[PDB]
């Protein structure tokens, strides 16, 4: 029980920001105990655990905050679609941050768990690197209204940063779509086909990850248990609409890339004709020549192979004439 | 389905109505006010001329060709009491056919 599933073993650090209307303190540490006392504090706190491959810390904080070990295993589980679970003590959501590489077109996903408990938010991540820097400066520099509100608005801000990163990823994918759409039409090779296959798989992954996100954000503003407070409904509504936008773009891109695949797949089944033509013309050309050469190659010791009128030039001339005749046999039916 | 209100789209000011098509060339308002006695055809470009026909007793047909000018659609909706979400649905083009019954 309580086993880590991902593939990250690089770094593990803990970060805490405690902000109020006037008070603010941000720090980083690597001891699980130091973040424990913040639970009973009335101030809105943000706790971040970058490395969850150390299961002991995860279990320790789970026991401290009085949460079910099943959701502990869900946090440790990494291959899972986003979901939302409303419990009386805490509300627990699962999201996925995406990263893209334009040099090598691949999509990397990281599972991130967010738990809201009264005046605290707990974030569990896979590796180091976040999309929450804008909200980090929002708390740090007091710009914006993040400090005035409670931890529900902090959950809203984290989800907003998530969907903003989704928008950036969609911009990168749109540029890739344009490049590939031009290249497939005007540069047909195998690398284009491999890139199109990779792009289709990446868009399928995006669809499978984003469609449950719509349901999560719908739940966070329709069911709205007392944890989120009635003052935060419109913001989650806005994030829900943003998720709708991201979806609709995802299906549009999927349709376009499927059309590209269909075009290339239609271009195939005519290379068979060309290659068959090449094979059959070279066979019809060169099998007769080999046939005659072998026939004159047999040593029966009684063949009229004497010089006479020079046999070798005559044989070569006749063979070349036969080859030219076989060539002329083609192109009559447009071969 | 729950309640309905204007969607919030990233990158736009709140409550902004945008035409989502590709045609931005033509605009006219053609009005046919007909009755049992005689008809009235009136093609124009000014938008204030057609607005008073909301209270006309005889049947009226107000054909606005060209919705790329969102201000005309917004003015017509504001005068006729059309809900802003209905105006957004008018302007939004990527939409399957549908019907909605209001009061």
């Amino acid at each position: 029980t309580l086993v880590y599933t991902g593939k990250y073993r690089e770094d593990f650090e803990i970060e805490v920001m405690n902000y109020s209307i006037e008070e603010f303190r941000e720090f980083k540490t690597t001891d699980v105990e130091s973040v424990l006392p913040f639970r009973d504090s009335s101030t809105p706190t943000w706790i971040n655990i970058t490395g969850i491959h150390r299961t002991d810390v995860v279990q320790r904080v789970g026991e401290f905050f009085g949460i079910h070990p099943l959701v502990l295993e869900d946090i440790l589980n990494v291959h899972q679609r986003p979901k939302v679970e409303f419990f009386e003590n805490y509300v627990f959501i699962v999201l996925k941050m995406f990263t893209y590489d334009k040099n090598l077109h691949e999509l990397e996903s990281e599972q991130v768990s967010l738990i809201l408990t009264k005046n605290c938010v707990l974030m569990f991540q896979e590796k180091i690197g976040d999309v929450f820097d804008p909200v980090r400066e929002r708390i740090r520099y007091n710009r914006g209204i993040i400090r005035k509100k409670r931890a529900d608005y902090l959950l809203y801000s984290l989800i907003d940063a998530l969907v903003d990163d989704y928008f950036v990823l969609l911009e990168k994918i749109d540029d890739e779509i344009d490049v590939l759409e031009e290249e497939v039409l005007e540069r047909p090779e195998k690398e284009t086909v491999q890139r199109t296959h990779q792009l289709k798989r990446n868009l399928v992954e995006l669809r499978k990850t984003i469609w449950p996100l719509r349901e999560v954000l719908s739940s966070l503003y329709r069911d709205v248990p007392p944890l989120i407070e009635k003052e935060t409904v419109p913001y989650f509504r806005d994030v829900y609409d943003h998720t709708i936008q991201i979806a609709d773009t995802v299906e549009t891109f999927r349709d376009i890339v499927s059309g590209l695949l269909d075009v290339y797949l239609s271009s195939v089944s005519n290379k068979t004709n060309e290659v068959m033509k090449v094979l059959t013309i070279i066979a019809t050309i060169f099998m007769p020549l080999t046939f005659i050469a072998g026939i004159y190659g047999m040593n029966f010791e009684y063949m009229p192979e004497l010089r006479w009128k020079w046999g070798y030039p005559v044989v070569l001339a006749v063979m070349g004439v036969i080859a030219v005749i076989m060539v002329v046999y083609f192109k009559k039916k447009k071969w | 389905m729950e309640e309905k209100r204007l969607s919030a789209k990233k990158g736009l000011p709140p409550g902004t109505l945008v035409y989502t098509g590709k045609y931005r060339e033509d605009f006219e308002i053609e009005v046919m006010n007909y009755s049992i006695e005689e008809f009235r055809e009136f093609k124009t470009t000014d938008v204030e001329s057609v607005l008073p026909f909301r209270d006309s007793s005889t049947p009226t047909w107000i054909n606005i060709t060209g919705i790329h000018r969102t201000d005309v659609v917004q003015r017509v909706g504001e005068f006729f009491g059309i809900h802003p979400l209905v105006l957004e649905d008018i302007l939004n083009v990527h939409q399957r056919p549908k019907v909605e019954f209001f009061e």
Partner: antibody
Amino acid sequence: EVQLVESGGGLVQPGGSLRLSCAASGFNVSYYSIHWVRQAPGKGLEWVASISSSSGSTSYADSVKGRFTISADTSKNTAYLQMNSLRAEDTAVYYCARSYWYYIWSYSYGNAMDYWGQGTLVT
Amino acid sequence: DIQMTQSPSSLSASVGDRVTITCRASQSVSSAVAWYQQKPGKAPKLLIYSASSLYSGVPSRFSGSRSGTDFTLTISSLQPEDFATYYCQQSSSSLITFGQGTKVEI
């Protein structure tokens, strides 16, 4: 019919202030977005600010943030840009341009300014 | 901030020629690039929006193309009225950014 007129320009002392007024005719500033575009003498165009009067959301370039302030009055169909703490690089010709939005994909929108005024010189 | 560069900084051509001016965007702007024309001493005039669409009433000599993250404005056949400066907008973000402009002269 659609027309934009710029006024309020003129020479001013450094570190001072100057209010530029953009009067719009033939269209309602409430339904559209209004941008201020700055062109230095013998230089390329630069973006100053944008106002969406219906929503009240304003946007500023990072090079004039804070010093410049943009607002709009719907009653007079006017767009005001008041400039404080003017510096040496601000001497330029200011144009006022109305822009609409267009749809590329369900996640991305762009705007293109249709009608521009004659522009006013500020030193 | 999204920085656009544009080349060439000045292009010389005669009437009847084809002229291409290309913008490169540092970041990724989806397709919200706009091409404007400014004659000396007068306000700019919008030519192309959405990287491939023509503003109403603009002559079909101008055309636009987008390869991924760089865009091209191509004039098939010049005319004496097309000898002006050409500018380049990105509008994906709320902060519009211009190019430095290319002066097409004789």
